[PDB]
Amino acid sequence: LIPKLPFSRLVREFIVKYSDDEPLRVTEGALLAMQESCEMYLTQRLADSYMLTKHRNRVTLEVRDMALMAYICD
Amino acid sequence: LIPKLPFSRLVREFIVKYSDDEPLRVTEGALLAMQESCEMYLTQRLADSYMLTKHRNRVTLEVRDMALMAYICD
Amino acid sequence: GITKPAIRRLARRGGVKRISGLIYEETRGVLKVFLENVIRDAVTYTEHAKRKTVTAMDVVYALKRQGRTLY
Amino acid sequence: IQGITKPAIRRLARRGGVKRISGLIYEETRGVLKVFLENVIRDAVTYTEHAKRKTVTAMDVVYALKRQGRTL
Amino acid sequence: ERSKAWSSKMADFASLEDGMEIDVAEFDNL
Amino acid sequence: ERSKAWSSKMADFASLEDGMEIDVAEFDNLF
Numbered sequence: 001l002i003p004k005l006p007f008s009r010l011v012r013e014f015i016v017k018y019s020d021d022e023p024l025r026v027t028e029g030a031l032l033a034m035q036e037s038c039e040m041y042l043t044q045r046l047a048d049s050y051m052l053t054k055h056r057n058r059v060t061l062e063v064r065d066m067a068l069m070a071y072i073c074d
Numbered sequence: 075l076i077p078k079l080p081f082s083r084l085v086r087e088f089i090v091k092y093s094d095d096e097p098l099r100v101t102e103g104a105l106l107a108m109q110e111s112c113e114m115y116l117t118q119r120l121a122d123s124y125m126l127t128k129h130r131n132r133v134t135l136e137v138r139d140m141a142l143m144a145y146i147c148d
Numbered sequence: 149g150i151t152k153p154a155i156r157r158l159a160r161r162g163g164v165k166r167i168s169g170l171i172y173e174e175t176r177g178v179l180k181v182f183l184e185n186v187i188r189d190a191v192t193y194t195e196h197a198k199r200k201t202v203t204a205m206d207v208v209y210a211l212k213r214q215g216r217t218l219y
Numbered sequence: 220i221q222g223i224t225k226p227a228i229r230r231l232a233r234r235g236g237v238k239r240i241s242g243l244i245y246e247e248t249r250g251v252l253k254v255f256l257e258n259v260i261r262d263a264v265t266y267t268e269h270a271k272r273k274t275v276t277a278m279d280v281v282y283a284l285k286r287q288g289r290t291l
Numbered sequence: 292e293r294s295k296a297w298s299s300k301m302a303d304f305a306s307l308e309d310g311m312e313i314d315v316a317e318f319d320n321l
Numbered sequence: 322e323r324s325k326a327w328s329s330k331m332a333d334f335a336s337l338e339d340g341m342e343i344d345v346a347e348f349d350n351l352f
Contacts, residue, residue: 002231004351006222010253012344014260015275022273023345024264029277029338036330037284038256039231044323045251047235055142056130061232062241066251068129072146072219073289076154082321084149084180086314088187089202097315098191099201103308107207110300112183113158115217116150118293119178121162122219135159136168140178147216204308208301215288218293277338281331291324 007035045069081109119143149176186210220249259283 011034015024052065085108089098126139155172187202189210194202211217228245260275262283267275284290312318342348 002224002227006224008344008348008351009222010220010256011260012348014257015264015344017257018261018264020268023343024267025274026342026344027274027276027338028340028342029334029336030263030275030280033277033280033334034256034259036334037259037280038252040330041255041290042228042231042248042252043235046232046237046248050235050237051142051145052129053237055126055138060239060241061237061244063243063247064129066244066247070251076150076158078321080149080151082318084183085187086318088184089191089314091184092188092191094191094195096200097313098194099311100314101201101203101308101312102310103204103304103306104190104202104207107204107304108183108186110304111186111207111211112179114297114300115182116155116175116179117158117162120159120164120175124159124162124164127164134166134168135164135171137170137174140171140174144178147219201311204304204306208304211297211301218297274341277334277336281334284327284331284334291327 001035002039004031004035007038045073075109076113078105078109081112119147149179185214189213220253223249223252258287262286 008031011026011031015026046061049065049069050061052068053059053061056065082105085100085105089100120135123139123143124135126142127133127135130139150172152172155175156167158175159167159171186207187210190202190206193209194200194206197206225245228248229240231248232240232244259280260283263275263279266282266286267273267279270279
């Protein structure tokens with residue numbers, strides 16, 4: 001897993017950003033679920049960008065593939 | 075556009091296949107809409123597979139790219 | 149499924165400059181997939197609505213019930 | 220994002236089967252994370268706000284994830 | 292930019308249809 | 322398939338939650 005130390009800062013940033021008027025508090029389960037989701041989602045999207053990498057018969061993932069991925073899935 | 079002669083072949087095949095006991099009558103507007111949709115969708119998906127082609131610095135679209143496309147969007 | 153040259157004409161519309169010989173068969177498969185889903189959904193909606201005829205609106209319902217149509 | 224652990228990016232890459240990585244990748248990955256998490260939190264907060272509750276819950280996270288479509 | 296074009300095309304499909312067919316009994320005449 | 326795995330994970334998320342926080346006022350205690 002990634003550490004909570006820098007992760008919770010970003011969760012806090014965005015809770016503050018999109019809560020209407022009161023910062024919207026948080027549960028522990030919410031934090032754990034967000035962390036789980038983001039870890040497996042980054043694993044997933046890296047794997048697919050590396051599939052693009054493999055597709056062009058090179059083994060080194062680079063921003064070419066990351067950007068094609070961004071163009072595919074917004 | 076593609077010709078109706080072989081297209082309605084397939085439209086009939088699949089109306090019959092999923093019909094639920096009565097062959098399902100399929101108006102002229104339905105036929106035209108299906109034809110339009112399939113033509114522009116094939117243009118689209120060919121263009122995107124050719125984007126994969128370009129991505130690997132080759133200009134000739136081949137089943138390598140078609141199959142990667144199949145993996146991406148089922 | 150598709151003719152032979154209509155595949156070429158759609159490729160040339162899509163900006164494809166060169167094509168492999170296998171492509172047509174693969175392209176046909178693609179078409180078979182797409183239409184087969186669309187008609188399915190359309191028929192099913194026509195079947196839910198208790199009508200006897202597939203319509204342009206039923207085609208629209210089938211297309212909209214795809215999601216991956218755009219990219 | 221600023222502190223999202225560099226070797227943690229490496230570890231997620233190695234989980235995904237990525238063998239070699241470019242140096243630019245980390246900032247791009249951070250961008251990706253910001254996008255994803257930002258959308259998720261947005262949706263979750265918005266649902267918590269519609270339900271007239273004060274606390275984001277795991278169920279609200281589930282609603283936000285489900286209201287994505289391109290997650291798969 | 293694709294989504295706008297598809298939404299236009301679908302808005303077009305919202306148009307007249309007529310000529311109910313009995314697919315096989317019709318398709319001889321295609 | 323990916324979809325099955327994500328749906329499993331989300332079904333999992335329907336679980337343990339407790340420990341409401343006032344994010345900053347509690348994030349000091351995440352070290």
